Design a protein around this ligand. Sequence first.
Ligand SMILES: Cc1cc2nc3c(=O)[nH]c(=O)nc-3n(C[C@H](O)[C@H](O)[C@H](O)CO)c2cc1C
Ligand SMILES: Cc1cc2nc3c(=O)[nH]c(=O)nc-3n(C[C@H](O)[C@H](O)[C@H](O)CO)c2cc1C
Ligand SMILES: Cc1cc2nc3c(=O)[nH]c(=O)nc-3n(C[C@H](O)[C@H](O)[C@H](O)CO)c2cc1C
Ligand SMILES: Cc1cc2nc3c(=O)[nH]c(=O)nc-3n(C[C@H](O)[C@H](O)[C@H](O)CO)c2cc1C
Ligand SMILES: Cc1cc2nc3c(=O)[nH]c(=O)nc-3n(C[C@H](O)[C@H](O)[C@H](O)CO)c2cc1C
Lengths: 152, 147, 149, 147, 147
Amino acid sequence: GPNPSDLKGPELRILIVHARWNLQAIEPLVKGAVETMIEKHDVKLENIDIESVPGSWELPQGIRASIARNTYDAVIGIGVLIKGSTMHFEYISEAVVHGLMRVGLDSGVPVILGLLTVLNEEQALYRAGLNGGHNHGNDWGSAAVEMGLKAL
Amino acid sequence: DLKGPELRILIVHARWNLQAIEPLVKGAVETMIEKHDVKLENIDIESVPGSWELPQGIRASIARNTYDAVIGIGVLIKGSTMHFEYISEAVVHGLMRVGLDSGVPVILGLLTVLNEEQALYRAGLNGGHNHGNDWGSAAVEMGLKAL
Amino acid sequence: SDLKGPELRILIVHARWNLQAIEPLVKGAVETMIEKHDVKLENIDIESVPGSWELPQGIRASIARNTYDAVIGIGVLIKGSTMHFEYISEAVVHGLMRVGLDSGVPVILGLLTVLNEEQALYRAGLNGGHNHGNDWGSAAVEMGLKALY
Amino acid sequence: DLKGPELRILIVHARWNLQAIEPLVKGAVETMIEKHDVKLENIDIESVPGSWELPQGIRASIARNTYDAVIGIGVLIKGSTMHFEYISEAVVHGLMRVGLDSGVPVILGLLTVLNEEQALYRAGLNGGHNHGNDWGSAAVEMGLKAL
Amino acid sequence: DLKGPELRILIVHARWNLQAIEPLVKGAVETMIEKHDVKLENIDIESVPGSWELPQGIRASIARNTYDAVIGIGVLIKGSTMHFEYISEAVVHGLMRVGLDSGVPVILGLLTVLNEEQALYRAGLNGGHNHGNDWGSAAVEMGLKAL
Ligand SMILES: Cc1cc2nc3c(=O)[nH]c(=O)nc-3n(C[C@H](O)[C@H](O)[C@H](O)CO)c2cc1C
Ligand SMILES: Cc1cc2nc3c(=O)[nH]c(=O)nc-3n(C[C@H](O)[C@H](O)[C@H](O)CO)c2cc1C
Ligand SMILES: Cc1cc2nc3c(=O)[nH]c(=O)nc-3n(C[C@H](O)[C@H](O)[C@H](O)CO)c2cc1C
Ligand SMILES: Cc1cc2nc3c(=O)[nH]c(=O)nc-3n(C[C@H](O)[C@H](O)[C@H](O)CO)c2cc1C
Ligand SMILES: Cc1cc2nc3c(=O)[nH]c(=O)nc-3n(C[C@H](O)[C@H](O)[C@H](O)CO)c2cc1C
């Protein structure tokens, strides 16, 4: 499984952009990422910006717009895509993931992937720390801090 | 709660499967006007032959005029060949690229369905929800956040 | 379409694998542009390349040499015993989208990605099918005009 | 008949599955020389460990010297993992990119097969047709059309 | 018989599945030093949380220092969601991009497997061949050919 770090980033500025489809799963993820950065990495509450966009499709664009306006040491993109009856899931999952990798590489700002691509709601909730699962948001918080520091 | 009386929105839609396209365009327009105070004269509506032309039509139009947000609308239905799989992927990638290259929010109004029924259901027919409404709200929201 | 493009310059690049299917497609695109959209025969350049893989590159080279208002890329890819079909279908389609977006010139997709010969011939107007080359011709004129005017 | 006595051709090939690679390189070279009058000293041949390095080895080489066309040759065989699926796609994409970025025609000589037999058959063994010959002609034609 | 006593090599590896990663890194390093005369001081070893961070970690590092070649090592195992499919593809595409953008050879040391056993087997355990050895030799070769 994952192997996080014990790094401190009191001076890091971190941006979190999350979609709003499936808020039930999004909230615990955001909260986990924030709590872990503060309590475990000494990031300051004032240095964490939180923005939202309607859906996962908008994540790469929202992130790109925000890092052009302000300066961040790392960004976490959070969203939940659930397979439905159409091929929508397959095609936008791929476009969004590609989009996030591009924004990070174009800008030089680490973009941490907080995108869940699941078959059903249960899988999402389970990865958000509910029903006995592990909250992946925590890992994302630690990844952001680590990448923020290594980025300089 | 978001109002954009000064927003300029572009809507580019393909012409294959007009039966499903029209309700989507209409739903988007009605929602922006009636619920976000966008002005009818501030909404440009253009069309292209098919979904393949969507990225290019949008790229050309945003180079000519200035818009706060764009909605690309089309309907791709799986057929007997592999056409559907390969162009769906290319068109979706194309739309993301035009949005990122230009800095202009591009809202995805592309239905990629197995059959006609699925598209109509997502256009508000037969008891379904009209996704066009969601796209209009998204365009307004992204347009405002874009500044 | 009631659109006329007597001043449009159109480029058609087609591959040579499966000429049986390629010819009717090219022919249908040309005849439609001329007879239905008043494009002038002398304003239509026709070029060929060995295979679909070369399509994006041939188009990129040609639109850097001359000026065109719209381009139509024509090729036929048929599923074989290897994964060749799946991988290059995807790369070629992506390449044609890229060339159109990089250059600003409308690229009409005239690429058939079929499971067998019959599907391609049918889409070329044979055996009771509709010739897709006609639609491509009309799309190139429309996009050419909207490219500018 | 296309003749290119003044063309400079580059051939970069991987080294995994040499049994299939050699005949492909050989067919491409023999065909350019014997049928298109390309000069032996005008053909550079380079190798890289595997297919993954093909795009990078080609990019490096066309930055150093000037070539009219390039042929990238390699063989990918489906194995037990998903490696085949993911690098086949990335390599093919990488080869298309290098060609478009540079303006130098890149001919695809990458076989993506399910097993060894399929690759040998396409290299001209066991009653099959050597695809290397086709690639040689394609490079000459694209080399001349590139100017 | 390639020797690169003056080569500077960078190795960036993720930390998911350390059980498989360590043997891979070790095989790569040992092979470069014992078989290609690369100096232990000239090998930088960095890590990142997961495979998703590999392309970015590598890009940041080759912007700071100068390396003749890079090896990106990570292990992606198929799970219950579609995560594996989507990020395997994006990471592989990402690594090819960083290598083509920068001009620095990037050796793919990414295992995309269906289960833990497949990964350990490819790391030289349970009778398998250590793929890290192959990657170390590829890096030396591409580093030397890169000039
Ligand atoms: C049919 C359909 C299904 C969608 N499913 C999701 C989903 O599961 N998760 C998500 O974040 N956004 C989803 N979206 C929203 C998408 O990311 C975006 O807001 C819209 O396509 C318009 O840009 C969906 C949109 C559509 C039209
Ligand atoms: C065989 C075939 C099937 C097509 N199916 C669709 C479709 O379902 N929806 C759509 O908007 N366009 C479709 N198109 C049109 C495509 O987006 C484009 O206009 C044309 O390929 C010419 O560039 C299709 C074109 C072809 C050749
Ligand atoms: C195994 C194999 C199958 C091919 N199938 C097609 C096909 O169906 N259509 C086409 O235009 N070209 C095809 N090509 C040619 C390809 O588009 C191209 O010319 C060359 O592969 C690299 O120049 C094929 C090439 C190979 C090696
Ligand atoms: C598990 C595995 C399977 C591979 N299979 C192939 C293959 O079928 N063909 C090929 O040219 N290279 C293959 N390679 C090598 C690849 O092209 C490249 O040299 C290395 O991955 C390091 O970049 C493979 C490498 C690995 C680790
Ligand atoms: C559901 C899930 C599965 C993951 N699986 C892997 C894996 O198999 N290998 C790996 O290196 N990283 C894995 N990661 C981590 C990923 O590469 C990355 O570090 C994090 O998503 C933060 O951007 C996974 C992350 C998630 C959320």
